């Protein structure tokens, strides 16, 4: 390296073997990503199939009990376990695998291996971009899913009472987590979540608009009715009319893109910024620092029996979510609340 | 063969077929 003799060691041979074109690229990052990701997906598929949740949550979340794909899940450990890492060799399981499954240790297994798999995957993105000599904008974009995963599956339960309040790996489990954030945190009212929603919706809009515009400015490039075969990667000309696209969107929307650089950087920028803002919001929620209330509105409605808004309706709905969900949601709290103290409307 | 392609393909394929047989067996389990 740098015009030097550089007598070869084991590292040169290992690097030469790892950095080779194959059916699947391995690289140095494959020493972490491949085992961690394989173990995460295998543990999730195993927990959704055989591992029960009857001990920790008091519910059935596996295929061996009668749950669907949208229903079975790898459930979090019990709240009394706290933020225990829940190793097999740890003081909880004590080297017993069939009770480690019953204690919710598979959730910690899948979560830690998924985090290290995400680390290894974005390292793999770095390594492949360095091998092909391209800028790692894919890794920069993938930094936002990693941030969302870290803030949601790690930072929020570490801020809360324990891993029990983390999202269980599933579908109905994630729906429970979402409704819990609605009822207990007022997560829709959070401006960071609003920014994240705007980012995702704008990114989907950008994807649809860019695809439709390119497919509708495709030039002739052939004689057949199928334009897909009119494309040639060898030619050095652009496959679509940027001038026509710019004039169309300038006369339709008022504004249009004039630079492909700026267009694709915006397509990169919008979802990453949205997901990072949502990650910051979930970090704020990790310590129950929630944008739950509007003080002026609540004082106005406290001194006025007439003043009602949709926000007051949402607050009333959140109260019902909390009251009617806590008793069967948190078995550690032992909330044996009678039905009369639970709030009701009229006749329902 | 037993190359990287063989190992990855079979590490995906074998447990999926085992689990699919397990799930098909669980379809006929009744309480």
């Amino acid at each position: 390296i740098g015009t030097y003799q550089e007598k070869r060691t084991w590292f040169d041979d290992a690097d030469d073997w790892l950095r080779q074109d194959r059916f699947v690229f391995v690289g140095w990052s494959g020493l972490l990503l491949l085992p961690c990701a394989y173990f995460a997906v295998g543990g999730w598929l195993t927990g959704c199939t055989f591992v029960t949740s009857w001990y920790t949550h008091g519910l059935a979340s596996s295929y061996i009990e009668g749950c669907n794909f949208l229903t079975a899940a790898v459930s979090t450990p019990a709240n009394s376990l706290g933020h225990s890492l829940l190793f097999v060799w740890g003081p909880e399981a004590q080297g017993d695998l069939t009770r480690w499954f019953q204690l919710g240790g598979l959730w910690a297994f899948v979560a830690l291996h998924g985090a290290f798999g995400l680390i290894g995957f974005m390292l793999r993105q770095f390594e492949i971009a360095r091998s092909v000599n391209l800028r790692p904008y894919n890794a920069i974009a993938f930094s936002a899913p990693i941030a969302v995963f870290v803030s949601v599956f790690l930072i929020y339960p570490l801020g809360q009472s324990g891993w029990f309040f983390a999202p269980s790996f599933g579908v109905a489990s994630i729906f429970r987590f979402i409704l819990f954030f609605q009822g207990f945190h007022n997560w829709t009212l959070n401006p960071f979540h609003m920014m994240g929603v705007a980012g995702v919706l704008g990114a989907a809009l950008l994807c649809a608009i860019h695809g439709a515009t390119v497919e509708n400015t495709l030039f002739e490039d052939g004689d057949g009715a199928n334009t897909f075969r009119a494309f040639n990667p060898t030619q050095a000309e652009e496959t679509y009319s940027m001038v026509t696209a710019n004039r169309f969107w300038s006369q339709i929307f008022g504004v249009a893109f004039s630079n492909k650089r700026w267009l694709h950087f915006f397509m990169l920028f919008v979802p990453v910024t949205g997901l990072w803002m949502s990650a910051l919001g979930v970090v704020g929620l990790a310590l129950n620092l929630r944008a739950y209330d509007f003080v002026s509105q609540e004082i106005r409605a406290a001194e006025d029996p007439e003043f009602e808004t949709f926000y007051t309706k949402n607050i009333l709905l959140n109260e019902g979510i909390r009251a009617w969900m806590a008793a069967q949601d948190q078995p550690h709290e032992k909330l044996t609340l009678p039905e009369e103290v639970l709030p009701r409307g009229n006749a329902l | 063969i037993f190359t990287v392609r063989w190992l990855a393909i079979h590490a995906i394929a074998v447990p999926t077929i085992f689990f699919l047989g397990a799930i098909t067996a669980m379809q006929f389990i009744q309480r």
Binding site: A14, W17, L18, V26, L31, P35, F87, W89, G90, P91, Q94, G95 | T3, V4
Partner: peptide, 30 residues
């Protein structure tokens, strides 16, 4: 003294070293 959790953690360190050595052997092979 040596608590059982500490003994299990040292055994876990040995097991992790064994796993890393096995991964190194697998990638030096093939």
């Amino acid at each position: 003294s040596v608590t059982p959790s500490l003994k299990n953690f040292l055994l876990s360190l040995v097991a992790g070293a064994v796993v890393l050595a096995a991964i190194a052997g697998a990638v030096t092979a093939v």
